[PDB]
Amino acid sequence: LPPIYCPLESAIHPRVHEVEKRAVEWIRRSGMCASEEERAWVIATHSADFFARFAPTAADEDRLLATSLFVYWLFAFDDTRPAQFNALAGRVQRALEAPSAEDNGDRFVPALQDIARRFRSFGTPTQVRRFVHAHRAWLSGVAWQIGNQARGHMPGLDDYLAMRLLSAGGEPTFAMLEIATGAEVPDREMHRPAVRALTEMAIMVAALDNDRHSLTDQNIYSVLMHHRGMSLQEAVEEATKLRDRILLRFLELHDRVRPGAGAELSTYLQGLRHGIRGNAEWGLRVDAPLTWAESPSDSSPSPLPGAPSIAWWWDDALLG
Amino acid sequence: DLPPIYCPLESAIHPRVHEVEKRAVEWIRRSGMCASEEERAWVIATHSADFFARFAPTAADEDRLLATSLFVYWLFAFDDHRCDNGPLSTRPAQFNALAGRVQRALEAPSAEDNGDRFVPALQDIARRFRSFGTPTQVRRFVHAHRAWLSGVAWQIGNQARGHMPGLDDYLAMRLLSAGGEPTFAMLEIATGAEVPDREMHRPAVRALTEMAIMVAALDNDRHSLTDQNIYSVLMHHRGMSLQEAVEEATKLRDRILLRFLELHDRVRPGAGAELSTYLQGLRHGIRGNAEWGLRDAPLTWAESPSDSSPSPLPGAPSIAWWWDDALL
């Protein structure tokens, strides 16, 4: 119901329409889609538009295209029993890490191995490893989500946020920023806990803005209605306060970290911000005047009570 | 009828192994990881300090060898109570949630246990790793850890279904499920020798690491001799007798160790000091895994490999890139 708090930079790659054209071509020739109907559904995600908002100045069009292809792949992959899914997650992950892996008629594997080949031609082995690890973390979150559903386990807030941090696909999406820009972030800066907390907070906000398409009954609203005995409206109210409070922490930690940051880490952080805005904006649009909340619905500087898995995001002692 | 192991690698053990084992035994008693005295004695009897003292035998800091040794105890204990034997060993849906809760606890110190006695123990190990490892080395460990849990989740999925994976899926799965990724990723932590990203992530070093892990895994399948292991896989998929499968298994394991030795000899000369140390660790680890498996008494080793082919293994495309030098 209420308008989104997002005081972050909005921009989109100027060559977005050219990337999109090539991406529609790759989707058609990729084998990942059985019928015309399924290819139109994938094309209709507008994933080139989505990702062009994450890396709006990427110098290499090919880089943007490759990264964009994976966002199309991820929406096509998302669209299985836990036991089979755990095997499928293992095979798909192996194919990403081993080019000699063979498809065995699985329609997703050749397409991901084509994305991986492209990533290997542009990115350092280091950047490829970051993407590989982010990819496994997303697959873990999806395995967790499919598990809860098969059992009829509605997770509490803490488990839901931990799981949705992985299952929403934000880890692999944000790990593509460097591959798209070419700006290699040194280990010493990338793995600073402060930078990990910023990455996870960007991911968590994009995930909660995606949930907002209550229009998978494992979502923040279901979780709060089931565990707090709230109505839908009391839960939309409570979800917005949680989310706004996370993005308020992100802006605060970002302003403490940005000043000292080198060129490559600065580009990456601008990416986090472009991606949070891009994610909210793309969700609302998929050129109408959009209204944005000028102010957060909850301004508390404190950790979320009930969510101890994310409280370290607020512990400055632990982030230095 | 069990042929001796081909392992012409350096066997060595930390001179302070007994001092570290004593501290390890006391941590175990205080950890809360063990419900009963029978469990404490089971975990102590793994001799995991002996095990990892063979992986990092010149570790300058005893506290680093202790912390990495604790995770080896933890791993045996978590494998035996939550992965291999209890209600979760055929309940992938419940395991996927545990894998998620444990992995999150490793990455987030503010995480709460929720009635899990394995979690506070892991968090203590994690606190140790963050006290003296770099954030980079901690992330290398965290990522290796999730990789191992994904293998176990795959394995448990296969078990619930009574699905016997083919050779390709079994080697892919077992590369993860046998716990070699997070075991080998603790070398740097024990040792203190931080390997730069550009060296660590080199396809050649990744392949040497996978090969080290795959030999240790198949040495572990041998040590344990329906069940998903190399022997049941070859018996089911090639219609072999146990005896033919034991011989086929030794052959393919020996082929992988030969490629590892061959790639090692090409990479080692140019390696800087930290990558050299890491490499030595892979070698010490393969041998130490095999040797700890067979235990005072004289051990017999095979002098020659049972198969000397220099090409990729038939029926396992997922590992063929270990032999592709243009890619490495």
The string of DSSP letters for chain A reads -PPPB--S-----TTHHHHHHHHHHHHHHSS--SSHHHHHHHHTT-HHHHHHTTSTT-S-HHHHHHHHHHHHHHHHHH---HHHHHHHHHHHHHHHH-TT---TT-SHHHHHHHHHHHHHHHS-HHHHHHHHHHHHHHHHHHHHHHHHHHHT----HHHHHHHHHHHTSHHHHHTTHHHHH--PPPHHHHT-HHHHHHHHHHHHHHHHHHHT------SHHHHHHHHH---HHHHHHHHHHHHHHHHHHHHHHHHHHTTT--HHHHHHHHHHHHHHHHHHHHHHH--PPPP-BSS-S----SPPTT-TTSGGGG-TTT--
On whether the CB atoms of residues A191 and B139 are closer than 8 A, the answer is: yes
Q: Is the dihedral of CA B72, B75, B79, B82 positive or negative?
A: positive
Identify the DSSP state of B12.
Answer: -
On whether the CB atoms of residues B256 and B270 are closer than 8 A, the answer is: no
Q: In whole angstroms, what is the distance from residue B154 CA to residue A89 CA? A: 8
| Closest-CA distance of chain B to residue A40, Å | 32
Read off φ and ψ for residue A171, nearest 5 degrees: -55, -60
For chain A, the domain total comes to: 1
Q: In whole angstroms, what is the distance from residue A92 CA to residue A78 CA? A: 13
On whether the CB atoms of residues B226 and B309 are closer than 8 A, the answer is: no
Q: In whole angstroms, what is the distance from residue B88 CA to residue B98 CA? A: 9
| Closest-CA distance of chain B to residue A13, Å | 30
DSSP 3-state of B6: strand
Q: Residue A231: which residues within 8 A CB-CB, separation 6 or more?
A: A225
Measured between beta carbons, which residues in chain A are less than 8 angstroms from residue B150?
86, 89-90, 93, 136, 139-140, 143
H-type alpha helices, B79-223? 92-107, 118-132, 135-161, 167-177, 180-184, 187-191, 197-200, 203-223
Q: In whole angstroms, what is the distance from residue B302 CA to residue B251 CA? A: 12
DSSP 3-state of B171: helix
Mutate to test the interface with B, among A92, A100, A132, A145 (most CBs of B within 10 A): A100
Q: In whole angstroms, what is the distance from residue B205 CA to residue B201 CA? A: 7
* A90, A128, A129 member nearest B154 (Cβ): A90
* A136, A163, A310 member nearest B146 (Cβ): A136
Per the entry, the structure determination technique was X-ray
**Cβ within 8 Å, pair A98-B201:** no
Task: Please name every residue paired with A5 in a beta bridge, in sequence order, or none if there are none.
Answer: A293
**Cβ within 8 Å, pair B93-A82:** yes
Q: In whole angstroms, what is the distance from residue A282 CA to residue A57 CA? A: 18
Q: In whole angstroms, what is the distance from residue A217 CA to residue A231 CA? A: 15
**Cβ within 8 Å, pair A89-B154:** yes
- Chain A: residue nearest B316 by CA? A101
Q: Residue B8: which residues within 8 A CB-CB, separation 6 or more?
A: B261, B301
Q: In whole angstroms, what is the distance from residue A92 CA to residue B293 CA? A: 32
Measured between beta carbons, which residues in chain B are less than 8 angstroms from residue A166?
100
Task: Please name every residue paired with A293 in a beta bridge, in sequence order, or none if there are none.
Answer: A5
| CA end-to-end span of chain B | 38
**Cβ within 8 Å, pair B318-A84:** no
On whether the CB atoms of residues A48 and A68 are closer than 8 A, the answer is: yes
Full domain range(s) for residue B282: 1-328
Vertex B286 angle, CA B281 and B291, to 5°: 115
Q: And the tokens for A3?
A: 């308008």
